[PDB]
Amino acid sequence: SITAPEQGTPVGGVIAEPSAQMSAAADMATGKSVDSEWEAFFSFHTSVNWSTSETQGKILFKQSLGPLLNPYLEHLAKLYVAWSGSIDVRFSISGSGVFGGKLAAIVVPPGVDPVQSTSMLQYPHVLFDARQVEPVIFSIPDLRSTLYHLMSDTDTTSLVIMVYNDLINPYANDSNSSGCIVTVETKPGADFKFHLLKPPGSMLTHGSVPSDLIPKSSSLWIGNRHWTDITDFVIRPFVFQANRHFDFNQETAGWSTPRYRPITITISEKNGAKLGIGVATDYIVPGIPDGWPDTTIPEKLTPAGDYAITNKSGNDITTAAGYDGADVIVNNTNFKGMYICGSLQRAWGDKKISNTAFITTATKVDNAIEPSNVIDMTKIAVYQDTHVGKEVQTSDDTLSLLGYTGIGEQAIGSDRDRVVRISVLPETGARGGNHPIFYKNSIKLGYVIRSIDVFNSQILHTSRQLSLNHYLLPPDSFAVYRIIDSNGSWFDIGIDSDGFSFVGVSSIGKLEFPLTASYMGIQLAKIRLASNIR
């Protein structure tokens, strides 16, 4: 009639039954003395260098409470809706004995966001010297207005370590700098408990923390404008992109999905007409194809001829010594700012082999195209010679972005007047004193064996996750990701509610690229994103 979740008549094994001598034998063979072992030891979290160069009031460590501190809780957290309780954060330091310098610890409450200033020491703080032998624990209490926390919650009690007195070596000169690195470990804490086991296949109604926006390695970073791998960051006062740029509301001012695949269209040039207007066949927005590139041409011009470049004085360039030896290029080519796009170019009765294309958003008046940076059903230009003679043909065509004919131009995405939008161009400036960044790719060129830079508002993994998954972030905060190169030079990127990325320094410089990215936490946008460049 009714049967509970643990109810039913047992018969057991029919040939044998469970034994305890064999389960005991596995505890003998193993070291199983208790379940949930992660509650019994401290697990590595991170480690910070404390050098003599660092004056007082600088923050070295800053984490808010939560289950993303310990990996063994980050795993079980996937099964539960809620959590509550305290974490224990052990600290270890191994000074030289002859060193001097004290280091402070502050458990700031929820609702605040620290600052690098000695005013933070006008507050309860524990100190510990470089000559500290044993580790210190610093349990972070769960101070909460609610009765339980969710997993999307981030306004929690935090702990910061900050320089109370500068580190001192009596032997070291004023020039040479020394240091002692401080290691940080975490343990679940005794009052920590997860809550409200969720059934699998369940949307969580607020999502989780933005911890999976940037991959942990640079091999998986590709731009949202061109499919190639990132190679460097670019700081500019204004950053803007529409097509594959997505915000935390799962909405976009663009026309394409976060994936690169060919562009199928149909084009119905009538008379001898090497150029025409193509119509969408695959689309998310009516009229515009998915994957159509978001950049216009510089000028009005008639595509009719061949390539042409010069070295500022009419001297044409036909060799690498001329191109690299040049300072600027004129680029008198008649099909300047377009994309080559191989173009299978099928039709009924067109037995001739296909010919490459050249595409942009632009108008058309009977021979030419004008730069129109507002894409529509009528701003889909093609120039590929679909062997038409005085008869409507209606060819089908599939196109795959390969290169960019705009030789000599600046990096793509550097001019808003040339960047394409539908109605609204997302754009930012310097929030706080933190400068935006483009992500830099490169794209192939026409007949030169060099390439040209390409700017990107996002990494494609960042766009993909923001199209599918739902995240909370107010418009005043950032989701922070600490970048660390191979030498150890690091800096923090902060992603916006708008989807744009920032950095807390005017110039990054050069750096080893087999680098990584780790989520540190949510951070208010005023506060300068930390960095250590060297």
Contact set with K ion (CB under 5 A) = 345, 350, 354
How far is 95 from 108, CA to CA, in rounded Å? 26
How far is 359 from 397, CA to CA, in rounded Å? 12
328 touches which of K ion, a copy of itself, none (CB within 5 to 8 A by kind)?
none
In the complex, the smallest distance separating the C-beta of residue 237 from a copy of itself, rounded to whole angstroms, is: 9
Q: Which two tokens stand for residue 228?
A: 């190639």
In the complex, the smallest distance separating the C-beta of residue 399 from a copy of itself, rounded to whole angstroms, is: 8
Three-class DSSP category at 324: helix
Give 121 or 368: the residue with its C-beta nearer to a copy of itself.
Answer: 121
271 touches which of K ion, a copy of itself, none (CB within 5 to 8 A by kind)?
none
CB 213 within 8 A of CB 461: yes
Give 100 or 298: the residue with its C-beta nearer to a copy of itself.
Answer: 100
In the complex, the smallest distance separating the C-beta of residue 16 from a copy of itself, rounded to whole angstroms, is: 4
519 touches which of a copy of itself, K ion, none (CB within 5 to 8 A by kind)?
none
CA 283 to chain centre: 25
One DSSP character per residue, 361-386 reads: SB--BTTBB-B--B--TT--EEE---
CB 384 within 8 A of CB 277: no
327 touches which of K ion, a copy of itself, none (CB within 5 to 8 A by kind)?
none
How far is 470 from 248, CA to CA, in rounded Å? 7
CB 423 within 8 A of CB 253: yes
**Chain residue whose CB lies nearest K ion:** 350
Q: Which residue has the tokens 């030169």?
A: 448
Give 230 or 347: the residue with its C-beta nearer to a copy of itself.
Answer: 347
Closest CA to 303 of 383, 219, 407: 383
Instruction: Please state the length of the chain.
Output: 534
Give 347 or 388: the residue with its C-beta nearer to a copy of itself.
Answer: 347
In the complex, the smallest distance separating the C-beta of residue 277 from a copy of itself, rounded to whole angstroms, is: 16
In the complex, the smallest distance separating the C-beta of residue 386 from a copy of itself, rounded to whole angstroms, is: 13
Give 72 or 513: the residue with its C-beta nearer to a copy of itself.
Answer: 72
Give 475 or 509: the residue with its C-beta nearer to a copy of itself.
Answer: 475
Give 254 or 303: the residue with its C-beta nearer to K ion.
Answer: 303
What is the residue type of 25?
A
Q: Which two tokens stand for residue 238?
A: 């204004």
What is the residue type of 287?
G
Give 203 or 353: the residue with its C-beta nearer to K ion.
Answer: 353
CA 485 to chain centre: 16
In the complex, the smallest distance separating the C-beta of residue 173 from a copy of itself, rounded to whole angstroms, is: 8
* 289 secondary structure, DSSP code: P
How far is 531 from 503, CA to CA, in rounded Å? 9
Residue 33 neighbours by CB under 8 Å, 6+ apart: 27
In the complex, the smallest distance separating the C-beta of residue 161 from a copy of itself, rounded to whole angstroms, is: 12
Does the CA dihedral 280-284-286-287 come out positive or negative?
negative
Q: Which two tokens stand for residue 136?
A: 């210190």
Give 218 or 343: the residue with its C-beta nearer to K ion.
Answer: 343
In the complex, the smallest distance separating the C-beta of residue 284 from a copy of itself, rounded to whole angstroms, is: 7
Give 363 or 528: the residue with its C-beta nearer to a copy of itself.
Answer: 528
In the complex, the smallest distance separating the C-beta of residue 357 from K ion, rounded to whole angstroms, is: 12
122 touches which of K ion, a copy of itself, none (CB within 5 to 8 A by kind)?
a copy of itself
Give 192 or 339: the residue with its C-beta nearer to K ion.
Answer: 339
Closest CA to 310 of 403, 405, 407: 407
In the complex, the smallest distance separating the C-beta of residue 79 from a copy of itself, rounded to whole angstroms, is: 7
How far is 375 from 243, CA to CA, in rounded Å? 11
101 touches which of a copy of itself, K ion, none (CB within 5 to 8 A by kind)?
a copy of itself
How far is 21 from 24, CA to CA, in rounded Å? 5
In the complex, the smallest distance separating the C-beta of residue 516 from a copy of itself, rounded to whole angstroms, is: 10
How far is 44 from 270, CA to CA, in rounded Å? 69
In the complex, the smallest distance separating the C-beta of residue 435 from a copy of itself, rounded to whole angstroms, is: 14
The end-to-end CA distance of the chain, in Å, is 73
Region of residue 57 (left: phi > 0; alpha: psi -120 to 50; beta: else): left
23 touches which of K ion, a copy of itself, none (CB within 5 to 8 A by kind)?
a copy of itself
366 touches which of K ion, a copy of itself, none (CB within 5 to 8 A by kind)?
none
Three-state DSSP string of 437-488? EEEEEEEEECCCCCEEEEEECCEHHHHHHHHHCCECCCCCEEEEEEEECCCC
Give 78 or 300: the residue with its C-beta nearer to a copy of itself.
Answer: 78
10 touches which of a copy of itself, K ion, none (CB within 5 to 8 A by kind)?
a copy of itself
